[PDB]
């Protein structure tokens with residue numbers, strides 16, 4: 402079997418992408434943030450503290466004839482940006498773009514951090530990292546992808562994120578019409594539970610390509626591109642007037658500047674991020690300082706190929722017994 406769903410940016414800056422997901426019987430449709438950097442499927446629900454819900458669509462397990470409470474199970478997760486949530490666990494039927502999994506663990510939020518409350522357009526997250534990172538206790542639960550794997554035509558899913566435009570998540574097949582050229586595959590390490598790979602280097606604008614190994618994770622759940630300080634300094638040095646701002650928390654640049662492209666290596670292949678993708682607009686309404694889409698990973702501890710990088714490519718997440726990542730231009 403296969404599945405295919407359209408994913409849509411939540412705002413004019415592509416800060417995140419939401420994808421409709423059907424939960425329960427009869428179907429309750431929620432718009433979830435597909436996150437290859439985490440492994441929990443959790444949703445706003447009728448159990449969430451009412452003061453922490455502000456416009457989100459909620460999952461109501463009592464109205465689903467297939468929902469079963471998972472006795473004694475709880476979950477608690479904290480994300481790298483400081484966000485967090487926690488609650489209890491149900492099992493229910495979950496469908497994505499025609500692809501159905503029965504008995505999927507649906508983690509019902511009782512408490513969410515403020516960053517989720519203020520994001521009215523995200524009803525929850527659907528984790529697509531490896532199941533070893535799932536936070537359900539005392540019995541760890543499998544991801545949607547892991548549960549669907551056996552029934553998929555091919556044990557893959559692909560991410561085709563749009564620049565200021567809708568895109569597609571496909572499960573079980575590779576749309577050979579969605580990319581140009583060849584797909585370059587590269588090795589994945591699962592030792593930390595992430596889709597972790599090693600980029601072969603980078604170039605700034607039309608500059609010389611620098612061969613150097615950058616270990617990082619492919620994370621659809623992170624907006625920006627987080628790279629080592631040496632790389633990020635070399636990029637912003639080519640932008641007149643750009644500087645690192647402690648009060649803002651990263652590199653800013655005059656909004657009138659034109660940004661150079663950024664190239665990262667995948668084996669012998671090259672993925673080019675257009676300069677316009679790195680512009681994230683004024684730091685505050687009316688400001689002539691703009692926020693940069695490439696930032697230092699020094700404070701994070703790991704390099705993150707977030708949406709800024711992934712949306713420049715067609716990305717294959719190959720969940721075979723030896724997992725690999727595939728990148729193609731589009």
Ligand SMILES: NCc1ccc(C(F)(F)F)cc1
Pocket residue numbers: 436437438439480481482620621622623701703705
């Ligand atoms: N998108 C989920 C996520 C959040 C944080 C991290 C970090 F910062 F710990 F690497 C990885 C993945």
Ligand SMILES: NCc1ccc(C(F)(F)F)cc1
Pocket residue numbers: 417434436438439480481482484516517520523622623
């Ligand atoms: N990386 C996972 C993640 C995704 C979205 C959010 C936000 F923006 F909704 F708070 C936080 C953390």
